[PDB]
Each structure stands twice: as C-alpha cells, then as structure tokens.
Amino acid sequence: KKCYKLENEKLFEEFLELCKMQTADHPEVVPFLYNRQQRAHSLFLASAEFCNILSRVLSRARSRPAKLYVYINELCTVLKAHSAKKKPENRIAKKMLLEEIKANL
Amino acid sequence: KCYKLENEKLFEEFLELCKMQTADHPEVVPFLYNRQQRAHSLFLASAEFCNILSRVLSRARSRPAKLYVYINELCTVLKAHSAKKKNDPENRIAKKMLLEEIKANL
Amino acid sequence: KKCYKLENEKLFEEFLELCKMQTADHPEVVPFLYNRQQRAHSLFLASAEFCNILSRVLSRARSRPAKLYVYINELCTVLKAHSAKKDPENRIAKKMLLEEIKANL
C-alpha cells in the first residue's frame, strides 16, 4: 500500500539540481541521470523504496558533497536495476522546438 | 480594460509548470521566458493574450502528456508578437573574459 | 553587530535564477557563480555588506540587463576574494561513470 510518486519526483529534482550545479564540466551526466529515471519502470519510481533511496542519497550528497559522483553513480545503478522499453505529436513538437533552440546558438 | 498583472500570474504559472516537467531539457524554460520577454509592449496586457494563456493553461493541465505542443503554441504566439533592439561594449568584454576564465578553471 | 545569512541566500538565489534565464547559451556560467559562493568565506556570506552587494547587483541586473555580465563578473570577484580554498573515492566513481556514459554511446 504505497505511492510516493510525487515526493520522489520532487526528491529527484532535489538531487538533480544538485548535479547541474556540481557537474558543470561534463554535460553528459545530467541527461544520463534523467535518462535512467525515465527508462525505469513506473512501479518503482512511485515506490516507498525509491523514496528512502533518494533520501539516504540526498542526505549523503549534502552530508559529504565532495563524494557526489559516488552518489550519482550509485543512483544510476539503482535506476538501472529497474527498466523497460519505451515510446506521437507531443514527441514531434518537442523535436521541432529543441531544434529551434540549438539553431539559435 | 488592461489585463497585464493578470497575465504575468498566468504565465508564471505556466512557466513554473514547465520548470518542473521539462527540467529535463534546461534550454526550454529560458527559451519560453525570453520569447515572453521579447514580446510586445502592449499585447502582453490584453484580454486576447489572457484567453490564450488561460486555454493553454487549461490543456497543459487537462492533457499534460501533450505539453510540448502547448509550449510550441505559446511560443509561436509570443514569437508572433515581438519588436527589436538587439551589443554593449563593456558587457562584451565582461562576458568573454569571464567565460574564458570558467574554461581556464578546467 | 548583525548576521544577515538567510536573506543572503534569498538574494543570491534570486540573482542566480535571473542568470539561469538570460545566460542559457552558457551553462557553465551559473554553476560557476553557484560555486564561487560555496568556496566563499563562512562568515562573509552572513555579513551585511554581502547583502549590500547582492541588492545593488540585483538592482542593476534588473535595471540594465544589457550589462548582465558586467555584474555576473563583478559578483564573482568579491566572491572569489573571500575564500576557503577547502576525496580519493570520488576519482574512480567520476571516471567509471564518465566512462560508462561514453560507453553508453
């Protein structure tokens, strides 16, 4: 009897914005983190198990920050341990938009 | 019949809806932000822009898997109301000096 | 005396977010700023003078945004001038994660 989903999503971006600040130099990270999140099955992403993980992570990432990449990598495996295949208009209208963005640098 | 402050609250709602979902792609939110900022002196307070921002807030809410559609539509509408004004000598130096010093941090 | 700390996080993050909107072609700028402030001296960040700075930089950044970088740059100077200068496990985790990501290509 558990759905923590929104607390998890609030708690992901907790940690994610901790990364965007900290892994500045290697852009490949943050999308890779967002990746393992969305590839992971919805049951887990909404579970209470996940909530204690993002928490014990967020606590560690705050407690000792100089270790951030351990925590990231840890979360990336945890998210990897859960998974699935994925995937029309809202797919399209996103491609068209980020093209326009990149076109403007 | 000046709808200005009513519209900002409406946009910043949408903008914030977007910060949450699309924080995935960070390029997006400040895009939308700037298409709104680069938008018209007047139309930004209008009942017309008020209806728009409301219906798009309706279906960004109503069907929120179809979001990016609505981010396009809002962009296009703001894209279709603009002006102008594009270089300040001191802010070009500061930018490039800093930017390069961030690189030299690497 | 006095200690201004919690308003200085509020004035910083206000700027720091104003920057996220107008320096978007340069994802390195904000995390740079964000971190110039972390390394920044423990006490200085509480001080009234740093509240005094953050108000004028916010005030100019709102008044003359064609000048934004004069101000981002300037905030960095003062913030650099006050510094700590303050992780063997991290090197591996960063590396193996970076390499997992390159391999994920």
Contact A46, A8 (CB under 8 A): yes
Range of the domain at C23: 1-105
Residues 6+ apart with CB under 8 A from B46: B3, B7
User: How far is B71 from A89, CA to CA, in rounded Å?
Assistant: 13
Query: A57 exposed, middle or buried (CB, 10 Å; 0-12, 13-18, 19+)?
Result: buried
Contact B38, B83 (CB under 8 A): yes
Contact C66, B89 (CB under 8 A): no
Residues 6+ apart with CB under 8 A from C5: C45, C46
Residues 6+ apart with CB under 8 A from C103: none
Gapped junctions in chain A, after residues (C–N > 2.5 Å): 87
| Chain C, window 36-95: residues with a beta carbon less than 8 angstroms from a chain A beta carbon | 87, 89-90, 93-94
Residues 6+ apart with CB under 8 A from A7: A51
∠ Cα B85 B88 B94 (to 5°): 140
Closest by CA position to A65, among listed A105, A13, A26, A21: A21
Which candidate from C20, C22, C67 shows the least CB-CB separation from B90? C67
Catalogue the E-assigned strands of chain C.
none
Q: Return contacts of B44-53, CB within 8 angstroms, 24+ apart.
A: B44/B4, B44/B7, B44/B81, B45/B2, B45/B3, B45/B4, B45/B7, B46/B3, B46/B7, B47/B1, B47/B3, B49/B3, B49/B7, B49/B77, B50/B3, B50/B6, B50/B7, B50/B10, B52/B77, B53/B7, B53/B10, B53/B11, B53/B14
User: How was this model experimentally determined?
Assistant: X-ray
Calculate Rg over the CA atoms of chain A. Answer: 15
First to last CA, chain A: 48
HSE-up of residue B79 (Cα within 13 Å, Cβ side): 11
Chain B residues with CB-CB distance to A17 below 8 A = 23
User: How far is B55 from B71, CA to CA, in rounded Å?
Assistant: 12
The DSSP secondary structure of chain B, one letter per residue, reads: ---HHHHHHHHHHHHHHHHHHGGGSTTHHHHHHHHHHTS-TTTTSSHHHHHHHHHHHHHHHHSTTSHHHHHHHHHHHHHTS-------HHHHHHHHHHHHHHHTT-
Q: Return contacts of B15-18, CB within 8 angstroms, 24+ apart.
A: B17/B57, B17/B60, B17/B61, B18/B67, B18/B71
Longest dimension (CA), chain C: 57
- How many domains does chain C fold into? 1
Contact B56, B13 (CB under 8 A): no
CA dist B58 to B8, B63, C58, C92, Å?
A: 16, 8, 34, 48
User: How far is C51 from C72, CA to CA, in rounded Å?
Assistant: 16
Which candidate from A25, A34, A90 shows the least CB-CB separation from B106? A25
Residue with tokens 């996940």: A50
Query: B86 exposed, middle or buried (CB, 10 Å; 0-12, 13-18, 19+)?
Result: exposed
Chain A residues with CB-CB distance to C32 below 8 A = 24
Q: Return contacts of A78-81, CB within 8 angstroms, 24+ apart.
A: A78/A53, A79/A33, A79/A36, A79/A37, A79/A39, A79/A40, A80/A36, A80/A40
Residues 6+ apart with CB under 8 A from A75: A15, A33, A36, A53, A54, A57
Structure tokens at A41: 């099955």
Q: How far does Cα C27 stand from its chain's mean position?
A: 12
Query: A35 exposed, middle or buried (CB, 10 Å; 0-12, 13-18, 19+)?
Result: middle
CB atoms within 10 A of CB A89: 10
Contact C82, C41 (CB under 8 A): yes
Which candidate from C27, C28, C69 shows the least CB-CB separation from B91? C69
Structure tokens at B60: 């960004």
Q: Please give the resolution of this entry in Å, rounded to 1 decimal.
A: 3.1
Q: Three-class SS of residue C40?
A: strand
Give C83's strand partners: C40
